[PDB]
């Protein structure tokens, strides 16, 4: 059974497309074939997004999938909230509840809050990039109201690649006036690596400084470059490599030829692509759930104009969401569950730390159990507290 | 020479449309007169926005006018930038240099920071709605870093109107 | 190297004169970067004519 779906992807998201095809291979079944409709249109142009969206709407696809810009998110919410077309997404969670907006990325803010709660910082600088949305900043400020924090937020994201240099040195010099020892970066992995490199060049990675990298890619980025600086570093991991399913994934993921699947022939993988690979599994699980429910869904593929006025939703699609949120299977991120709003729930994220031997887990943050230390933790300086008789 | 133009007035903005009528009265001239395509649709709904927009685009109107939501700014910017069609708005200014974009609101942030400097304040609360955008927030924080301040920003605007008192 | 400079820490040396080849100068400077001991409070003296030649 052919089952057409969309396939939006940003240019340069090659690893995700490769992993996507990997999802097509791994979970293909004789009962029905998924029918991806790949489109590598740029995410930056909301109009282009509209174009691809109406295009796949002409394709009559029963589902659409892809990334979105902060600039583009409202468009996808508007249309999917309009035509009742379901849309899964790896990208950052929506700031507002919406219909037909499944979202693969676990909310991260609460773990960040609990993380600060552990280190008990009173004051810190907070760099951030606009592109993922400022909601995290709103959160840390709201906490700053209650927890009494003198946070110093700054957006680094406006800076040009052409002169991304002195702007940094000028920036950290400004931090020196407050003599900040504690900063939370919040950037995309590329700018993450760049800022880290600049921290290296300015040398502010010696002991007495500390950092917190607010993303799931904490292992995905290089840290070997700063591992020996003596400054402590800690982050997050949605993807335990120690997991048997995950190591099993690595067994083949390394094997794939670099030509057919560029960026895939590596020991590791970006968490995002992993979320894609999981997402295809979730989708297919849903469709497997539908046929078992014997629910006809063979809507006409000649949907016509998406701009049609009045726009009439087709009911079976509305039903689809009802299955989607109810779906529950394991993935590279581990167990996944959804709320009635389509936000992820019942998830938990590992708290990584870097050590001289290498990166290591120390605990896990449940959304309900908050921070939870592993027993893996050892001990402090036992001088046997020198016993003194008298 | 009648000249077709767009008209995108958000619902409930009566005084604005009336002012538009007065504007049509004050500047009417025999050489040419504007031909409004007036519409009253929700500004939040980017879909409907695109609907009326392409609708007037079918008219091929040589200019378009209306407001935009923070949710919708990207829409109109993406279109005027793509379609190379001129547009005018009294909505709050974009943070970027967008072609084919006219805007009646002068930037207010510099005057605001100036006003701050006039009182020589060091610490203050900063309530904000999310609707007009966080640009002023980013600004006041930027000054806060350099001038060494103590911001206490809060997002009042997400609060539900039903229990709107207890909060 | 890390074993080496750690040994220097026991004396808490702030002052070192390197005397090495253009390549060795590079590798040494690199390791000094990785260990971060190019911070203020340290000092160095590169004993050769290639000081400008080096990628400092
Ligand atoms: C019966 C059942 O599904 N229990 C789940 C468990 O499998 C999962 O590990 C945990 C965290 O997601 O949430 C609960």
Swiss-Prot record, chain B:
Induction (record text): Down-regulated in the pyramidal cell layer of CA1 in the hippocampus by global ischemia.
Tissue localization of expression: Detected in forebrain. Detected in dendrites of neuronal cells. Expressed in the pyramidal cell layers of CA1 and CA3 and in the granule cell layer of the dentate gyrus.
Post-translational modification, as annotated: Palmitoylated. Depalmitoylated upon L-glutamate stimulation. Ubiquitinated by RNF167, leading to its degradation.
Subcellular location: Cell membrane; Postsynaptic cell membrane; Postsynaptic density membrane
Protein family according to the UniProt entry: Belongs to the glutamate-gated ion channel (TC 1.A.10.1) family. GRIA2 subfamily.
Comment, domains: The M4 transmembrane segment mediates tetramerization and is required for cell surface expression.
Quaternary state and interactors: Homotetramer or heterotetramer of pore-forming glutamate receptor subunits. Tetramers may be formed by the dimerization of dimers. May interact with MPP4. Forms a ternary complex with GRIP1 and CSPG4. Interacts with ATAD1 in an ATP-dependent manner. ATAD1-catalyzed ATP hydrolysis disrupts binding to ATAD1 and to GRIP1 and leads to AMPAR complex disassembly. Interacts with GRIP2. Interacts with GRIP1. Interacts with NSF via its C-terminus. Interacts with CACNG2, PICK1 and GRIP2. Interacts with GRIA1 and SYNDIG1. Part of a complex containing GRIA2, NSF and NAPA and/or NAPB.
Additional record remark: The postsynaptic actions of L-glutamate are mediated by a variety of receptors that are named according to their selective agonists. This receptor binds AMPA (quisqualate) > L-glutamate > kainate.
Primary role: Ionotropic glutamate receptor that functions as a ligand-gated cation channel, gated by L-glutamate and glutamatergic agonists such as alpha-amino-3-hydroxy-5-methyl-4-isoxazolepropionic acid (AMPA), quisqualic acid, and kainic acid. L-glutamate acts as an excitatory neurotransmitter at many synapses in the central nervous system and plays an important role in fast excitatory synaptic transmission.
Annotated protein name in UniProt: Glutamate receptor 2
Organism field: Rattus norvegicus
Residues of the full protein shown: 25 to 191 of 883
């Amino acid at each position: 059974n052919s089952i057409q779906i969309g396939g939006l992807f940003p240019r340069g998201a090659d690893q995700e497309y490769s992993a996507f095809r990997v999802g097509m291979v791994q979970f293909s079944t004789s009962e029905f074939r998924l029918t991806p409709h790949i489109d590598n249109l740029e995410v930056a142009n909301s109009f282009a997004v509209t174009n691809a969206f109406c295009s796949q709407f002409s394709r009559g696809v029963y589902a659409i999938f892809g990334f979105y810009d902060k600039k583009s998110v409202n468009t996808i919410t508007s249309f999917c909230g309009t035509l009742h077309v379901s849309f899964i997404t790896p990208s950052f969670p929506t700031d507002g509840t919406h219909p037909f907006v499944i979202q693969m990325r676990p909310d991260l803010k609460g773990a960040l809050l609990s993380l600060i709660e552990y280190y008990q910082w009173d004051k810190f600088a907070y760099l951030y990039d606009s592109d993922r949305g400022l909601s995290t900043l709103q959160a840390v400020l709201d906490s700053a109201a209650e927890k009494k924090w003198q946070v110093t937020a700054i957006n680094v994201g406006n800076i040009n690649n052409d002169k991304k240099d002195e702007t940094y040195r000028s920036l950290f010099q400004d931090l020196e006036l407050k003599k900040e020892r504690r900063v939370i970066l919040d950037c995309e992995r590329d700018k993450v690596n760049d800022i880290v490199d600049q921290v290296i060049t300015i040398g502010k990675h010696v002991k007495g400084y500390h950092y917190i990298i607010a993303n799931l890619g904490f292992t995905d980025g290089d840290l070997l470059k700063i591992q020996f600086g003596g400054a402590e570093v800690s982050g997050f991991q949605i993807v335990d490599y120690d997991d048997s399913l995950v190591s099993k994934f690595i067994e083949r993921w390394s094997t794939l030829e670099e030509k057919e699947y560029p960026g895939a022939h590596t020991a590791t993988i970006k968490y995002t692509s992993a979320l894609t690979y999981d997402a295809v599994q979730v989708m297919t699980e849903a469709f497997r759930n539908l046929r078992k429910q014997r629910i006809e869904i063979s809507r006409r593929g000649n949907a016509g104009d998406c701009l049609a006025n009045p726009a009439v939703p087709w009911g079976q699609g509305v039903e689809i969401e009802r299955a989607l949120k109810q779906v529950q299977v394991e993935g590279l991120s581990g167990n996944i569950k959804f709320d009635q709003n389509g936000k992820r729930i019942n998830y938990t994220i590992n708290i990584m730390e870097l050590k001289t031997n290498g990166p290591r887990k120390i605990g896990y943050w449940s959304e309900v159990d908050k921070m939870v230390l592993t027993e893996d933790d050892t001990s402090g300086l036992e001088q046997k507290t020198v016993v003194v008789t008298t």
